[PDB]
Amino acid sequence: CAFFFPNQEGEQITRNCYTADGKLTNILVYRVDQAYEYPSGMEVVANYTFADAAGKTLNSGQMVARCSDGNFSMSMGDVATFPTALNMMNADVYMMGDLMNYPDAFSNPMNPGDDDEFDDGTLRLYQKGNKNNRAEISVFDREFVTTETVNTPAGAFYCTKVKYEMNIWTPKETIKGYGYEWYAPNIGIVRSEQYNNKKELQSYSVLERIKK
Amino acid sequence: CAFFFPNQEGEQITRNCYTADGKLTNILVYRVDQAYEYPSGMEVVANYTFADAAGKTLNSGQMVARCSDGNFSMSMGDVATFPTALNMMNADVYMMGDLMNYPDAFSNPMNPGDDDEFDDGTLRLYQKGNKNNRAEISVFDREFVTTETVNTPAGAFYCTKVKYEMNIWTPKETIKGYGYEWYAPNIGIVRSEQYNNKKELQSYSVLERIKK
Numbered sequence: 001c002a003f004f005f006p007n008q009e010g011e012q013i014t015r016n017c018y019t020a021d022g023k024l025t026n027i028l029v030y031r032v033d034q035a036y037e038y039p040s041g042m043e044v045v046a047n048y049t050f051a052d053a054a055g056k057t058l059n060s061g062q063m064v065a066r067c068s069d070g071n072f073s074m075s076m077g078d079v080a081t082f083p084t085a086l087n088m089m090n091a092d093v094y095m096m097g098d099l100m101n102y103p104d105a106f107s108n109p110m111n112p113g114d115d116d117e118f119d120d121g122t123l124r125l126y127q128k129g130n131k132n133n134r135a136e137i138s139v140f141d142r143e144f145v146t147t148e149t150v151n152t153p154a155g156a157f158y159c160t161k162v163k164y165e166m167n168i169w170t171p172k173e174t175i176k177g178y179g180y181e182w183y184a185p186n187i188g189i190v191r192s193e194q195y196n197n198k199k200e201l202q203s204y205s206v207l208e209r210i211k212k
Numbered sequence: 213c214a215f216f217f218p219n220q221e222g223e224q225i226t227r228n229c230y231t232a233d234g235k236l237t238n239i240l241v242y243r244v245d246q247a248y249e250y251p252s253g254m255e256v257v258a259n260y261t262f263a264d265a266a267g268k269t270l271n272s273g274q275m276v277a278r279c280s281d282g283n284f285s286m287s288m289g290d291v292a293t294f295p296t297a298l299n300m301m302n303a304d305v306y307m308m309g310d311l312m313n314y315p316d317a318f319s320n321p322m323n324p325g326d327d328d329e330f331d332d333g334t335l336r337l338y339q340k341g342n343k344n345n346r347a348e349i350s351v352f353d354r355e356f357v358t359t360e361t362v363n364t365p366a367g368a369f370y371c372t373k374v375k376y377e378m379n380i381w382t383p384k385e386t387i388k389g390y391g392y393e394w395y396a397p398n399i400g401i402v403r404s405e406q407y408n409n410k411k412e413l414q415s416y417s418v419l420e421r422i423k424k
């Protein structure tokens with residue numbers, strides 16, 4: 001039963017967000033606030049902060065990572081690293097999504113293309129006091145690609161690679177596309193990449209720092 | 213696409229909680245804070261307050277009810293009306309659960325015993341600053357029983373009746389049992405009842421007031 005998120009109290013993970021041209025747009029910081037033990041597995045409550053490239057905080061809140069029975073799931077905070085999301089955030093923006101599951105390829109092996117073990121999820125963001133500033137990010141058809149080492153500024157991590165489709169709606173536009181993400185035990189998302197339906201890179205994020 | 217929760221801004225629903233002997237233990241109050249429209253359906257953010265029989269607030273927070281595509285789901289706040297939950301709550305207690313789905317029997321008819329349309333869910337509660345005060349409520353094997361009118365102090369509502377099993381764990385004890393709930397469009401839970409595995413009534417709740 002692997003836990004795909006940091007789980008030591010006080011531990012802090014930083015992930016950087018980039019434009020397709022490699023420019024830094026945002027910095028996401030998670031800090032483990034509390035880890036609780038349950039017979040069926042663990043519960044981790046973490047604080048998140050989303051800031052811009054100059055370190056100004058755009059949004060902060062709490063999220064949860066958990067193991068129940070054999071199964072790990074967590075809040076969809078990470079899909080908020082999509083540019084549409086990052087660009088509409090401020091202190092009055094809130095978000096709600098499903099807890100999304102992350103299968104353990106490393107113990108339960110999967111063939112490339114396996115998808116029935118991955119659940120779909122929808123994240124909605126909205127500004128309190130300004131309803132027009134809202135968004136919906138739907139992630140679906142997630143499937144296994146491979147397991148492989150990914151090299152990042154925080155180090156080299158053996159990861160599970162997943163491919164997914166997504167729909168992003170705001171009152172001003174619909175964007176359709178696809179993405180990849182790579183995740184690892186005790187870290188969560190190590191790397192992600194977003195594309196439009198023409199296969200043109202829109203953005204990406206990479207694990208930048210682990211502070212235990 | 214029925215929405216099983218109040219959805220007019222400002223609307224307020226009160227549900228009363230009782231011991232098996234009919235004594236009032238707690239009062240739960242939901243107030244619709246904001247309703248947001250998305251192409252795929254609606255998002256409702258509501259504030260909840262849990263109080264004791266004398267009106268002293270035990271816990272408050274926010275929760276979400278939503279329609280996405282054809283499917284309604286919501287936070288598991290209502291399973292917090294179990295006595296173990298009610299009795300451990302204070303201002304420093306927080307809770308996290310899955311968004312749990314509520315099928316629309318009224319449009320998509322179900323035969324008694326149908327269960328594959330209902331998802332399982334786990335709610336965990338914990339006190340910040342006092343880890344020993346925590347709990348887990350697992351709800352599973354939910355299935356359709358019937359549709360029928362239920363008479364309450366707020367009125368008579370045509371409801372879907374569901375049966376479920378549950379496991380309740382705290383560091384001091386495990387309780388195993390089963391329950392029934394009745395839900396209706398634009399209200400949510402109209403009535404619920406909890407039993408232990410000997411079929412002895414442990415508690416119940418009934419819709420008390422709708423203020424639009």
Ligand SMILES: [Ca+2]
Nearest residue numbers: 113114115143
């Ligand atoms: Ca497949």
Ligand SMILES: [Ca+2]
Nearest residue numbers: 113114115116
């Ligand atoms: Ca498939």
Ligand SMILES: [Ca+2]
Nearest residue numbers: 325326327355
């Ligand atoms: Ca059945």
Ligand SMILES: [Ca+2]
Nearest residue numbers: 325326327328
């Ligand atoms: Ca079945």
